[PDB]
């Protein structure tokens, strides 16, 4: 009596095509459980129907044929989790792809876990410094916050994320464990060579050490790409739940949606708006809710998320775009127009926001950029309203003079994340009007000069601003002195 293949813990492929198996026994599988195919190929029980189980396949369905034996696993899908992953490149399931050996994991985690409720969290209060003035000044990001990077192809979205990860060496190479930030980079639908490039740079920047990279690229099965984000999420909660700090980049959630759409349609689930399943909102909400700030009762750890979304024809109003913008705690909108115009990063002041406000900013920063945002907004307007110098007063001449100067200061190159104090110094200079007489064209050069000066000579002021975290009365006075004088020598 060979009883190994009873229809309760096992089943047999009735048919297979396009990555969907319609398995025949599996009488005791649970919705969302993982099963195994003769071929060592893992799948997931998504539809539990009266007469069959619809199984989504985590791999090339070419090796599956009608009749194959499918085995339960008894487990809802999960993945390796923990410190072992740092510095390693894994696939959507955890397996290493850097051919640097197995991961030494001792912990696992279900990819699909509800985000901590109301009780377990505390208001986001600690900054998450990007290194980018524009960002850190105008659309602040705190830990446990979700902030979106959105824009058309090539407007620079990934760069925002890279610079951030890289800026984290400051604290990670440091002493303080509370300030440390472990990073997770999830590439989705992307191209292998691009990712390989990515991991190189991270390595060259000495950032891999604290980063884990989950890769679910273009040729990866739909379900891998689909799962990928949740996978990476789970690895992040490890840190979050253990009083440690993590940062996760979902690059990008657009390609995952298509995978979801595909996976979903191939399971015969009626297409919805724009062809996507009626639950794409949910697909993302569920995920991003997980990024969170835990109270001291739960370790005070946190997970901060930076999902990316690609618009078309810079149309942010778009259904998906809006679906995600309505979940996150703000957005960074990059325009190609600005980009070409010289405004790099192409952050669109007006359209980008942070729902956390200054609570995620050091007093130093709040001090300098407290009103700047709405100022620039109001600037952009009059700048338009006078593209014909219409009987213009002074308050507005001053308004355009600041506007331009400030706009120049928020410009920034790549791969050179600035330290918080550095930012304050430079913004300071502008906001205070010390630059209102400099020629716009000069500004950038000045900032390089100035920053040079203080860093080299004045690190005492830098270290105090940095340390006190505020701009004291004397610091504000030692600053005035420097700028004004240097500016003059400079304006020889």
């Amino acid at each position: 009596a060979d009883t190994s293949v009873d229809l309760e813990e096992t089943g047999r492929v009735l048919s297979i095509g396009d990555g969907i198996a319609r398995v025949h026994g599996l009488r005791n599988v649970q919705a969302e459980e993982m099963v195994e195919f003769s071929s060592g190929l893992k799948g997931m029980s998504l539809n539990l129907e009266p007469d069959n189980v619809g199984v989504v396949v985590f791999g090339n369905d070419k090796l599956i044929k009608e009749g194959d034996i499918v085995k339960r696993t008894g487990a809802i899908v999960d993945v390796p989790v923990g410190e072992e992953l740092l510095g390693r490149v894994v696939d959507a399931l955890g397996n290493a792809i850097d051919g640097k050996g197995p991961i030494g994991s001792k912990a696992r985690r279900r990819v699909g876990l509800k985000a901590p409720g109301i009780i377990p969290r505390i208001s986001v209060r600690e900054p998450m410094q990007t290194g980018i003035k524009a960002v850190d000044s105008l659309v602040p990001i705190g830990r446990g916050q979700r902030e979106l990077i959105i824009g058309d192809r090539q407007t620079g979205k990934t760069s925002i994320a890279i610079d951030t990860i890289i800026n984290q060496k400051r604290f990670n190479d440091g002493t303080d464990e509370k300030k440390k930030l472990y990073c997770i980079y999830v590439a989705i639908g992307q191209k292998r060579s691009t990712v390989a490039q990515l991991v190189k740079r991270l390595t060259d920047a000495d950032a891999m050490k604290y980063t884990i990279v989950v890769s679910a690229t273009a040729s990866d099965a739909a379900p891998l790409q689909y799962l990928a984000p949740y996978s990476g999420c789970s690895m992040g909660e490890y840190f979050r739940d253990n009083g440690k700090h993590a940062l996760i980049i979902y690059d990008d959630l657009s390609k995952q949606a298509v995978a979801y759409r595909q996976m979903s349609l191939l399971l015969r689930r009626p297409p919805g708006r724009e062809a996507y399943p009626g639950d794409v909102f949910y697909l993302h909400s569920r995920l991003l809710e997980r990024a969170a700030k835990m109270n001291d009762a739960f370790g005070g750890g946190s997970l901060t998320a930076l999902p990316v979304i690609e618009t078309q024809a810079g149309d942010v109003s778009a259904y998906i775009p809006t679906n995600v913008i309505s979940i996150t705690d703000g957005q960074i909108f990059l325009e190609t127009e600005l980009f070409y115009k010289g405004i790099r990063p192409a952050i669109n002041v007006g359209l980008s926001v942070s729902r956390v406000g200054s609570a995620a900013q050091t007093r130093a920063m709040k001090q300098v950029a407290g009103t700047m945002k709405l100022e620039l907004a109001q600037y952009r307007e009059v700048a338009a309203f006078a593209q014909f110098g219409s009987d213009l007063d002074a308050a507005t001449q001053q308004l355009l003079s600041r506007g331009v100067r400030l706009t120049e200061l928020l410009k920034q190159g790549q791969y050179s994340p600035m330290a918080i104090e550095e930012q304050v110094a430079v913004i300071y200079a502008g906001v205070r009007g010390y630059l209102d007489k400099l020629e716009p064209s000069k500004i950038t050069k000045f900032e390089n000069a100035f920053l040079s000066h203080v860093i080299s000579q004045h690190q005492a002021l830098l270290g105090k601003i940095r340390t006190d975290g505020k701009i004291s009365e004397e610091s504000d006075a030692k600053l005035k002195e420097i700028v004004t004088n240097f500016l003059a020598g400079f304006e020889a």
């Binding site: 009488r27 005791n28 599988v29 649970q30 919705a31 969302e32 459980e33 998504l46 539809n47 539990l48 129907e49 009266p50 699909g112 509800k114 985000a115 901590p116 409720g117 109301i118 009780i119 969290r121 505390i122 208001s123 986001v124 689930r269 919805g272 708006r273 009626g278 639950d279 909102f281 949910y282 569920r286 809710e289 969170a292 700030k293 109003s317 778009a318 259904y319 809006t322 913008i325 309505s326 705690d329 007006g350 359209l351 926001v353 729902r355 956390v356 406000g357 200054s358 709040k366 407290g370 009103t371 945002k373 709405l374 907004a377 109001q378 307007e381 219409s390 009987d391 002074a394 308050a395």
Partner: protein
């Protein structure tokens, strides 16, 4: 009765009962779960099989799993012992403070008040917000709606109203968070406490809370609003008090439905919506109402997909309101907060017979000029300003100034504006505008009119700006 699960596909679970088929709306409990899973019966497929919507995750469910008919729709603990507490779609405490010991329980599903139960009193409910008050006054016991696309201020506005109104309000308040951000319920809870609206030590709690956030399955989302609303109807009827109902965001109720609609086997209606949208909305919105027994003052936030007010949802909701505050990204984009659209916001009490003509003439006055200016915007854009008559270039002036005077620093957005929140009284509003309209400030600069409270601050700010 006891049924078995026969199929699981997402939030929708089909159940087969051998004997006695649970009626539609009935709640069923899934046996064998660490957590309580309720399934609401949605349809009778026939063959003694019912199609249902899960009130929670369906992972782990197995074909054949046991399910008992609870014999009744979802019933929740309703009553005064709900105050200061946090509840589930299904009435479970989620604040970690122990059971909710109510004398009674209520089904979240119920008929709406009859026509002969309607009330018609209409009395202005001053908020302190220049815009609203001036142009689209809210009404005590009325239905208010805050419309806005993603990130334009719906929540903040609901936030300042809680502060400016809920806070003094002598009566209960029920805030229901439907399909919104979890971070948000935590911000709010802890604020209610630090301000004593919620009291954890005694019975001075003046606000009950109900939550079914974005991290939930469509099922929960399709119901929390009911739960919430249900709590509120108690205090209206069984106690007869003045309730204040806050829902953020009612859109989520509708999107919830759309999310399972297909799995229920329905041809989609337009824009992807389910074909029962309106009725689904109707049977709900009709409960959210003031009656002769008690009074409700509901403030509902309404999401506008893609910024398109014509979307079947936002569109379908306008008729349910007595007062509407329409927010616009175009306004917000300029830095004008609260980003209300002065020409798209309305109130049923904007009647001379109700607020008076000074009120009225001002409002209308304010609106004419803004309209007058809208029309010209696109034209002087290209053709420039010279050819414009002094007559017509003064309205460009006054208009741009008003556009500003309409902004206001909220007390709940200092983290945003970097400005102390100002509350303005009705007359300070009327007068201030009255004056601008009168030519009485054609000397001060526009900027003096941006982000300030009362007109005097605009005058003071002129000077400060005077260098």
């Amino acid at each position: 009765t006891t049924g078995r699960i026969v199929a699981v596909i997402g939030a929708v679970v089909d159940v087969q009962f051998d004997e006695g088929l649970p009626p539609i709306l009935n709640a069923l409990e899934v046996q064998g779960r660490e957590t309580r899973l309720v399934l609401e019966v949605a349809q009778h497929l026939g063959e003694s099989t019912v199609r249902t919507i899960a009130m929670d995750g369906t992972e782990g469910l197995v074909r054949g799993q046991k399910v008992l008919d609870s014999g009744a729709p979802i019933r929740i603990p309703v009553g005064p012992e709900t105050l200061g507490r946090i509840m589930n779609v299904i009435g479970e405490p989620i604040d970690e403070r122990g059971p909710i010991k109510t004398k009674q329980f209520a089904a979240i599903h119920a008929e709406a008040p009859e026509f002969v139960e309607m009330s018609v009193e209409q009395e202005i409910l001053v908020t302190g917000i220049k815009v609203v008050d001036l142009l689209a006054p809210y009404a005590k016991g009325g239905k208010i709606g805050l419309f806005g696309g993603a990130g334009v201020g719906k929540t903040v506005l609901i936030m300042e109203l809680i502060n400016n109104v809920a806070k003094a309000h002598g009566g209960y308040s029920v805030f229901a968070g439907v399909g919104e951000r979890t971070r948000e319920g935590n911000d709010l809870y802890h604020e209610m406490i630090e301000s004593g609206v919620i009291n954890l030590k005694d019975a001075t709690s003046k606000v009950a809370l109900v939550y079914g956030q974005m991290n939930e399955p469509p099922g929960a989302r399709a119901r929390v609003a009911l739960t919430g609303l249900t709590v509120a109807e108690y205090f209206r009827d069984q106690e007869g008090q003045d309730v204040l109902l806050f829902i953020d965001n009612i859109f989520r109720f509708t999107q919830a439905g759309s999310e399972v609609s297909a799995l229920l086997g329905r041809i989609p209606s337009a824009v992807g919506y389910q074909p029962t949208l309106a009725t689904d909305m109707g049977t709900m919105q009709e409960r959210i109402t003031t009656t002769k027994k008690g009074s409700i003052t509901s403030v509902q936030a309404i999401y506008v997909p893609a910024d398109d007010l014509t979307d079947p949802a936002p569109a379908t909701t306008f008729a349910h309101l007595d007062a509407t505050t329409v927010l616009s990204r175009a306004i917000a984009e300029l830095g004008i907060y609260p980003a209300v659209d002065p020409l798209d916001s309305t109130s049923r009490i904007m009647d001379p017979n109700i607020v008076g003509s000074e009120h009225y003439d001002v409002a209308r006055g304010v609106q004419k000029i803004l309209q007058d200016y809208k029309s010209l915007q696109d034209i002087i854009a290209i053709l420039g300003m010279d050819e414009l008559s002094e007559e017509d270039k003064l309205t460009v002036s006054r208009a741009r100034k008003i556009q500003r005077f309409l902004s206001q620093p909220f007390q709940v957005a200092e983290v945003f504006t970097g400005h102390l929140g100002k509350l303005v009284p009705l007359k300070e509003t009327i007068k201030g505008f009255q004056q601008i309209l009168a030519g009485e400030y054609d000397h001060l600069p526009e900027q003096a009119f941006y982000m300030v409270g009362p007109i005097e601050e605009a005058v003071a700010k002129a000077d400060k700006l005077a260098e």
